[PDB]
Amino acid sequence: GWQENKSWNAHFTEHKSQGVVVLWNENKQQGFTNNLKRANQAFLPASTFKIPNSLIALDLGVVKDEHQVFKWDGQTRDIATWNRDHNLITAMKYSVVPVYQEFARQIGEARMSKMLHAFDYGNEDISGNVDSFWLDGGIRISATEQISFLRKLYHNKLHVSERSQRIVKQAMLTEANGDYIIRAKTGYSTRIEPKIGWWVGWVELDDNVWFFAMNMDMPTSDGLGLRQAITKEVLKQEKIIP
Amino acid sequence: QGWQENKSWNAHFTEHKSQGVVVLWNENKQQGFTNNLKRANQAFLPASTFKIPNSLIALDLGVVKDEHQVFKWDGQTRDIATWNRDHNLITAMKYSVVPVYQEFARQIGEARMSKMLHAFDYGNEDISGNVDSFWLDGGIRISATEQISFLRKLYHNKLHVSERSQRIVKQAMLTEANGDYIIRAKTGYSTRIEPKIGWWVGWVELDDNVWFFAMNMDMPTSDGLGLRQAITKEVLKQEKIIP
Ligand SMILES: *[B@@]1([O])OC2=C([C]=[C]C(F)=C2C([O])=O)[C]2[C][C]21
Ligand SMILES: *[B@@]1([O])OC2=C([C]=[C]C(F)=C2C([O])=O)[C]2[C][C]21
Ligand SMILES: [Cl-]
Ligand SMILES: [Mg+2]
Ligand SMILES: [Mg+2]
Ligand SMILES: [Mg+2]
Ligand SMILES: [Mg+2]
């Protein structure tokens, strides 16, 4: 089904890394990946889980809108940007775990489980703490499963309101120029080996949309920038972005 | 809610032998800034900045079902090549595709167009002329400061049209985004009556504030259209709004 393009391995090998990029051409309904096996390997979603978590929190009114302020709890954490008040936009932008842990507690494990089943999300397993299972519990999702979920969100087909989906897609906005719009979410899974980085999302063109999902070995935080860099190299190689 | 006149911004205009006005509005502080209070309050044809209210009305009335609905090219080849193809709301805004918005306006009709603009408090609310061309050569006029007042309502979902229509139009206004800011805006270019001018109106979203802007400048030929964004960006950089 998917076409394998092993030449993209060159972009990982340049940085003494390994990983997978998965692309989906929405118009043609064709998929491409450098590694058919790793494309289907399920990992902790880590902070890419902020996408379904945001959708669920909005649909249940835990988050009223993208302006609602979630005040800092006063606990100083290692990521300076977390130590301040946030709304949905900035909590996504800075991947603010304590804000989303409060969402998850308010959602509760019964509703969290039902929504992930409704979303057909990964292995639909929330075993672990209700406020950390996407970092060190049972939930597992592959890059191709991320594409599936993102396609539903793009088409407003997920089992939540249209408004919720529109707001989350606004919150995913990452980059836009006159050539393309990227809506995406990064993730860095460090609590359980193997430590991996994620980038999942899509590229909007005038006449098409390319969905992507990538993950890569990430032993130290020094390489986090390679998630976007390698993905963009693949997008350029494939003539999706100039 | 006061105003400061900062005439040092004029250096960005005179560098290009241009003249114009930039108006900024700091939402958090409710403070306005401009290089020219007189011109900030002079009203002009909106030209294609009218695509913002026009999109809202078309969406709210169901003339546009959503941002994917295709509006077909009428087969008349026009000067701007990107016009000569099918469009949706996103690409029609991006390329300022007048023929698509003229079809919107004809479907909206005079009475509904007039009612909506009054309820929006949009400029002088005057649609005199052809319903599908009054923003190019009819009676509608709007000042840069009046553009801000309208845009602030849109940002806050305070217009009387649906929240959905307001969200879709703000998505369609997306012009630039990065790790430092988001710009939602619409360009305009008006030549059918004097003075010929370029517009750029919209806002800059920061982590913790929103800066609304509305600029216009003399545009004696189309050669200077790019100065609309470049001069605005120079002012935003001078004021430390963007890096
Ligand atoms: B999560 O996966 O998001 C995250 C963390 C640390 C560093 C990062 F770059 C990212 C990210 O990808 O946004 C921790 C909090 C979680
Ligand atoms: B409108 O004012 O928009 C427009 C036109 C021509 C060239 C442009 F750059 C622009 C603009 O400002 O987007 C014509 C169609 C109208
Ligand atoms: Cl957006
Ligand atoms: Mg390289
Ligand atoms: Mg299932
Ligand atoms: Mg200059
Ligand atoms: Mg009025």
Side-chain angles (χ1 to χ4, degrees), chain A residues 51-241:
Chain A
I51 298 173
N53 207 356
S54 297
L55 288 166
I56 298 161
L58 281 161
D59 214 52
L60 301 178
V62 172
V63 171
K64 293 292 188 243
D65 62 28
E66 72 274 24
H67 302 298
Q68 182 182 356
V69 173
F70 299 91
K71 285 222 140 243
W72 177 42
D73 64 3
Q75 192 187 325
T76 290
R77 300 185 169 79
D78 292 328
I79 298 186
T81 55
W82 293 5
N83 303 325
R84 54 158 102 163
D85 301 345
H86 285 282
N87 58 43
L88 187 77
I89 311 296
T90 61
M92 281 266 294
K93 173 183 185 174
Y94 297 107
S95 207
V96 185
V97 162
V99 171
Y100 280 87
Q101 296 183 299
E102 178 62 30
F103 296 173
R105 289 188 288 266
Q106 292 188 27
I107 292 164
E109 62 170 53
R111 294 192 298 195
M112 185 73 75
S113 181
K114 288 162 172 160
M115 290 282 211
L116 291 195
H117 168 56
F119 290 171
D120 200 26
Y121 183 94
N123 71 351
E124 299 168 7
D125 178 343
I126 69 157
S127 57
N129 306 128
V130 67
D131 54 9
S132 75
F133 65 85
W134 64 95
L135 307 168
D136 56 15
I139 186 75
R140 299 289 182 280
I141 189 166
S142 78
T144 55
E145 284 159 3
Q146 294 261 30
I147 301 280
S148 281
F149 169 75
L150 293 167
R151 289 185 69 245
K152 296 171 185 109
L153 172 59
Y154 176 84
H155 290 292
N156 299 322
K157 292 300 169 72
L158 289 167
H159 193 52
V160 290
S161 73
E162 180 182 308
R163 175 185 180 270
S164 289
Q165 293 173 91
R166 285 196 187 274
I167 292 172
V168 172
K169 286 185 276 191
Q170 177 187 354
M172 286 169 64
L173 176 60
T174 296
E175 196 188 341
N177 67 5
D179 288 325
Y180 59 81
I181 292 156
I182 296 175
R183 307 187 184 276
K185 178 64 183 91
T186 50
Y188 186 21
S189 173
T190 63
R191 291 187 186 198
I192 300 298
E193 296 289 318
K195 301 202 182 70
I196 60 145
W198 279 103
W199 201 33
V200 304
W202 62 79
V203 183
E204 306 178 9
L205 304 178
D206 283 347
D207 190 30
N208 199 3
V209 47
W210 285 83
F211 296 82
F212 65 90
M214 78 87 67
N215 60 67
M216 65 178 285
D217 300 352
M218 191 63 63
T220 77
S221 68
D222 285 339
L224 285 172
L226 300 172
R227 297 169 302 178
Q228 301 97 326
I230 293 169
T231 301
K232 275 199 178 89
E233 285 168 308
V234 168
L235 298 168
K236 294 166 170 287
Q237 179 174 333
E238 298 307 314
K239 313 291 203 232
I240 296 161
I241 69 180

